[PDB]
């Protein structure tokens, strides 16, 4: 039961790329007809906070990654294909703009 | 540009405890009046999927963690206090029940 120091929490939760379990439906929202397997994939994506109403944590460098995913159409069997997903290598706190 | 094998994706995204950036407002929803700093904290929490409509990823062993967080009331300055947060040590896919 050791407390985490304010400086350290602040540091640790500041905007950065963190491994994120993302739903494949979120990434591929036009595929309504399919059920995916697994439902989700791990991706390096921006996360944490900027603690400043004017700033957002956003990717400044991206890259791609490709995985075999099983697409399951009802009464039509399962085909395993390759799907691609963006990943975030660098994140910054940057000004929101409307 | 190397592909991830289906077996490996499946394995890697299956229900497990993963470091998660959680908004403190989510964890402490009665504190409307305060702004927290940082907005969020990193916690080990259950995540990923069970790929089976009948199952949910849920914690089977929990523990606590304590952090200094800055509470900011408007026109009333900032006080740094200790807040506690549940963490998830073990996760299982378990049957949903209504």
């Amino acid at each position: 039961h050791e407390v985490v120091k304010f400086m350290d929490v602040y540091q640790r939760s500041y905007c950065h790329p963190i491994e994120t379990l993302v739903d494949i439906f979120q990434e591929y929202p036009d595929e309504i007809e399919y059920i995916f397997k697994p439902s989700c994939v791990p991706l390096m994506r921006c996360g944490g906070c900027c603690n400043d109403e004017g700033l957002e944590c956003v990717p400044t460098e991206e890259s791609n990654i490709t995985m075999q995913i099983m697409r399951i159409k009802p009464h039509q069997g399962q085909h395993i294909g390759e799907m691609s997903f963006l990943q975030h290598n660098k994140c910054e706190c940057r000004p929101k703009k409307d | 540009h190397e592909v991830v094998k289906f077996m490996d994706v499946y394995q890697r995204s299956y229900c497990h405890p993963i470091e998660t950036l959680v908004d403190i407002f989510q964890e402490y929803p009665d504190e409307i009046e305060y702004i927290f700093k940082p907005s969020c904290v990193p916690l080990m929490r259950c995540g990923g999927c069970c790929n089976d409509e009948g199952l949910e990823c849920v914690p089977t062993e929990e523990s606590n963690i304590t952090m200094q967080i800055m509470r900011i009331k408007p026109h009333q300055g900032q006080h740094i206090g200790e807040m506690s947060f549940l963490q998830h040590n073990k996760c299982e896919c378990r049957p949903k029940k209504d």
């Epitope: 304010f6 400086m7 350290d8 540091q11 500041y14 900027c50 400043d52 706190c93 | -």
Partner: antibody, heavy 121, light 108 residues
Framework: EVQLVESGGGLVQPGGSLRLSCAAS????????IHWVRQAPGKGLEWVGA????????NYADSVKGRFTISADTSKNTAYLQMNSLRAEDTAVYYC??????????????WGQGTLVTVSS | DIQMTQSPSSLSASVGDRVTITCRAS??????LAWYQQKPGKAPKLLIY???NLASGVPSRFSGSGSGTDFTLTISSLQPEDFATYYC?????????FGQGTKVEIKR
């Protein structure tokens, strides 16, 4: 044009006191964290402590706790390192430096020139 | 406290050599390692932050990598003015401990 300017370096008696001062321009120290780092002559850098001027939060090295006090003056845009009960092994060049939103935390991209605090009878 | 162990303590390389300097953390540091260069009697200069990003306006021959507890600064083509002492620093847990620095010499 961000710079940090230090002053206050000098000679001091063992046991005595000194207030290093770190004057910012080009940004507001309020909207950032100021750290202090020192370097014993010939040795490597050691972190002294930091301050979050918005709130006055401070965090110090165990090697320096209870003796040193970091402080800030948002109106005068200036941080301060207050040295008490000084020792021989406290003889070093003292740096202040700042962390802002441009970099991820504690990567400090602008520093002061450094003053030499030398503790001697 | 987290101990940071740099290696080598000193190295001597020729101009245009690719030089690497490793830094090893006693526990995991998420990726919060930064690399500073220090020319004698001057403030350190930030080179790399968050393990792997180039600090603004630093020459690209400077490159950082590593994940876990093992990290590396790489100068890809050592230049006459790269002569300096390089330090790594860990930001994950106070105190913010530095490596003991690697003292790079140009061999001519």
């Amino acid at each position: 044009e961000v710079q940090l300017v230090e002053s206050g370096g000098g000679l001091v008696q063992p046991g005595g006191s000194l207030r290093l001062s770190c004057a910012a321009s080009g940004f507001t120290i309020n909207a950032s964290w100021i750290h202090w780092v020192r370097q014993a002559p010939g040795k490597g850098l050691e972190w002294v402590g930091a301050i979050y001027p918005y709130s006055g939060y401070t965090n110090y090295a165990d090697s320096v706790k209870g003796r040193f006090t970091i402080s800030a003056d948002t109106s005068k845009n200036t941080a301060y390192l207050q040295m008490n009960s000084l020792r021989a092994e406290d003889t070093a060049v003292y740096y202040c430096a700042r962390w802002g939103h441009s970099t991820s935390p504690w990567a400090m991209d602008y520093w002061g020139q450094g003053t030499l605090v030398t503790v001697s009878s | 406290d987290i101990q940071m162990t740099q290696s080598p303590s000193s190295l001597s390389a020729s101009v245009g050599d690719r030089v690497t300097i490793t830094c090893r953390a006693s526990q995991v540091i998420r990726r919060s390692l930064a690399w500073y260069q220090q020319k004698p009697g001057k403030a350190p200069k930030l080179l790399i932050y968050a393990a792997s990003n180039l600090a603004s306006g630093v020459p690209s021959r400077f490159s950082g990598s590593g994940s876990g507890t093992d990290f590396t600064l790489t100068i890809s083509s050592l230049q006459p003015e790269d002569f300096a002492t390089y330090y790594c620093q860990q930001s994950n847990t106070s105190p913010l401990t530095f490596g003991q620095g690697t003292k790079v010499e140009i061999k001519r």
